[PDB]
Structure 1
Amino acid sequence: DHPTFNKITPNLAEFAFSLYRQLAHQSNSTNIFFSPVSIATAFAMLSLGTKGDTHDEILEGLNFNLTEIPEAQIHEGFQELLHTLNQPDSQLQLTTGNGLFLSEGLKLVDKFLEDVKKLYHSEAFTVNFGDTEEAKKQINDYVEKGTQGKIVDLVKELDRDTVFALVNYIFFKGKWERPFEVKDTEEEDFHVDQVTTVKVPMMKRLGMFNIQHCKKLSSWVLLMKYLGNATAIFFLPDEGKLQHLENELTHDIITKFLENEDRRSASLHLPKLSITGTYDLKSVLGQLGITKVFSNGADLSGVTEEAPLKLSKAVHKAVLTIDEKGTEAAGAMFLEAIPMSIPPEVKFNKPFVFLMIDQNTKSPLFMGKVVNPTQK
């Protein structure tokens, strides 16, 4: 009977897909990119300072069923996971932070201040929202320092009555276990749709890949490993099957693709790009059923005993960069031969979906859809 993160990873997966479809329904002409694990962890942390329905609503909102699993194990699970995710010091640049900002006019509960800081290794600051421009600068300064300037001016303006603000961000850049030759990267066409074309740098390599064409999903399924036990899963939907692919993704199916270990020879064309997702959590989580904590009825007596408090603003920003880089230090020479037959062509020159997974812990680090590679 030891604390484990094994129990919640399945639900994190379901949460990834729930949020994804919600966003995919709102618009289908825009890129989608977010971190399931980051968002879930922040709110799992927040819940510790809430009580009653407000509390039960947050967890249910993250796809948990309080009868299916004990409340105590949900919290321990996120604590373990965080200690595993919050320090994968291999050569996978993964910086992620949680920053809480509360008005100086509130008497805060110690216990809460200690959990966020010692257990969840997150930040809790007091600020004077009386001076909006000053408060704003403090929030942005924090995120800029944490991302090393990789993320600036996240907040544009604070509301007059802002009393509690949450900021979650994450940045990622990996190294392929098997690099692409920078030389082969050439400018090709990316077909946004029948009449829209975008010029983009296309990486490419002919080789053996863990690739398979799933008839259930009507799509090509490609897995590529990063150094640091992180696995990228790309999905290239057949003509007119983007929606079917989106509606059919479930955690059970992902678990299966990861069992395939057979390789195949293919010509792969993958765009070189950088995408970012920026979302107003109050707006998106509200649709998923998480509303109380953002309302006047909120029960945050775990944060401040008697004062009427509510989460005024919550933002999430995710940034990912993908290129041909792999094993640094010099060109570790690989071997490339000529096929006996013409291998299949798998070009990601049209809208596609991808998912990033920590092979170790099996948690969904990222999920997204690229409709336009230059809409970064």
Structure 2
Amino acid sequence: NKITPNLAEFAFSLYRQLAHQSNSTNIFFSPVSIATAFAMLSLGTKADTHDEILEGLNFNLTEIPEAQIHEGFQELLRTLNQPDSQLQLTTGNGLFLSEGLKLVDKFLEDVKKLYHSEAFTVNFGDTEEAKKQINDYVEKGTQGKIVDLVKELDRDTVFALVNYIFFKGKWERPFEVKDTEEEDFHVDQVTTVKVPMMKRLGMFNIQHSKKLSSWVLLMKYLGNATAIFFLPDEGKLQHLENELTHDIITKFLENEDRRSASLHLPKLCITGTYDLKSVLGQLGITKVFSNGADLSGVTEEAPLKLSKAVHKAVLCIDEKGTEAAGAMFLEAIPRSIPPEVKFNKPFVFLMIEQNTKSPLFMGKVVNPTQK
């Protein structure tokens, strides 16, 4: 599929921003769930509003027309719904509509044809019935991996573009369940904690790259899939992160060779939860949340903007295989033109005696509890 390279780079792009944001934290995300939600969103959007997005999903528009893109997506999504039988792989892109919404059909058609979208009809005014209906469609799409994707749901909520992906794949070679031997994880420069560490001896597709100063191990799944890992060298984690490319990835994919090794790889369950707004904004994708937000391509009546862009992604690893899930969530409610200035982020301020123009106090609010 012709679009894959861009996705890869967008995954690297997007990963980078998340680590650039917090070194001291766990990271896991679905580049696909995200980009899809947004390409699938890009349809209701037009002009320079829309352009930002797809140059920010790492696409070169002075090269590929819009048509050739959305085809690629369509193809890929399809591919994933029909794997080998031993490999469980689903994806669903449901679109929940407020009851009483005057739509455009050009949009309506397009997301149904190209993005297998499912439209449902919910009362956002009954917000805690709306939360249920939506957390229903996720907590089954993800087959019960992700449930609480919507914790706060606006009543003024127009619609909600929702996306999910479910993965469950068993290993090429399961691990010894009795050989799962609790061990030390050297967490930071400084600290150490106990994990259920799985150990196995055998012949492994693994190599060191001078370029990435890392060990690159591949673990083929039962079916048509592969997890790739990277043991950075001592103090090379950031150098590694720095240096990842699609083509480097491709090179590794094809390396068929194996060799003897003793491997220790831990049993774990992790989550990444995100409001991406900030993050994405950094990728150039700012207009679509704002009051210059072009959502004409969805409906006439009312003028909207994209409220919160929320991703959540869990992962879980054990001897037999992997459980992995991604899940987008784009809320939109009525845009209001009248310009908006909210001090919902840390800020400064004085207080001045009018007559003599002298500061009584000054300060910076950085948090109101407890400070």
* Alpha-carbon spacing, 1:57–1:329, altered in 2? closer, same or farther (3 Å): closer
What is the 5 A alignment of 1:202-281?
A: 202-281=197-276
Deviation of the 1:177 alpha carbon:
1.2
Per-residue CA deviations over 1:208-239 (Å, capped at 9, x if unaligned) read 11111112111111011001211111000111
Residue in 1 that maps onto 2:87: 92
Farther-moved stretch of structure 1 (99-108 vs 256-265) = 99-108
By percentage of residues, which structure has more strand? 2
User: Matches of 1:183 and 1:94 in 2, distance apart?
Assistant: 29
Contact 1:38 1:365 in 2 (8 A): no
Quickly say closer, same or farther: Cα 1:328–1:152, change in 2 above 3 A. closer
1:194, distance to aligned residue in structure 2 (A): 3.3
TM-score of the aligned structures, taking structure 1 as reference length = 0.81
Runs of at least 5 residues in structure 2 that lack an aligned partner in the other structure: none
Tell whether the 8 Å contact from 2:268 to 2:317 is kept in structure 1 after alignment: yes
Report how far residue 139 of structure 1 moved. Answer: 1.5
- The verdict on how the C-alpha distance between 1:228 and 1:371 changes in structure 2, with shifts beyond 3 A counting, is farther
Q: How many residues align?
A: 371
> How many angstroms does 1:362 deviate by?
66
Q: Deviation of residue 88 (structure 1)?
A: 2.0
Q: Residue 372 and residue 229 in structure 1: after superposition, are their counterparts in 2 closer, same or farther (change >3 A)?
A: farther
The 1:305–1:325 alpha-carbon spacing in structure 2 relative to 1, beyond 3 Å, is same
CA distance change for structure 1 residues 361 and 158 in 2, over 3 Å: closer, same or farther? farther
CA shift, 1:196, in A, is 1.7
Alignment CA distance shift 1:339-1:226 (3 Å): farther
Query: Is the Cα contact below 8 Å between 2:160 and 2:331 reproduced in 1?
Result: no
Distance 1:16 1:291, change over 3 A: same
Worse overlay, 332-341 or 283-292: 332-341
What displacement does 1:65 show?
A: 0.9
| Further displaced range: 241-250 or 45-54 | 45-54
Give unpaired runs (5+ residues) of structure 1. Answer: 1-5
| Maintained 8 Å contact 1:203/1:269 | yes
**CA RMSD between the two structures:** 17.3
Deviates more, 1:65-74 or 1:324-333: 324-333
Deviations 1:292-348 (A, max 9, x none): 222222112221035311222332222222211169999999999999999999999
Q: What aligned pairs does 1:296-315 form with structure 2 within 5 A after superposition?
A: 296-315=291-310
Identical counterparts, % of pairs? 98
User: Alpha-carbon deviations, 1:238-295, whole Å to 9, x = none?
Assistant: 1111100000001121111123222111110001122222222333322211122222
Q: CA deviation at 1:152?
A: 1.8
- Contact 1:164-1:313 within 8 A present in 2 as well: no
TM-score of the aligned structures, taking structure 2 as reference length: 0.82
Q: Deviations over 1:136-190 (max 9, x none)?
A: 2222122123233332222111234433333333332211112211121110111
CA 1:110–1:205 in 2, change beyond 3 Å: closer, same or farther?
Answer: same
For residues 101-133 of structure 1, give each alpha carbon's deviation from its aligned partner in whole angstroms, at most 9, with x where no partner exists: 333343011232233234312222332222322
Call closer, same or farther: CA 1:125–1:369 in 2, change over 3 Å.
farther
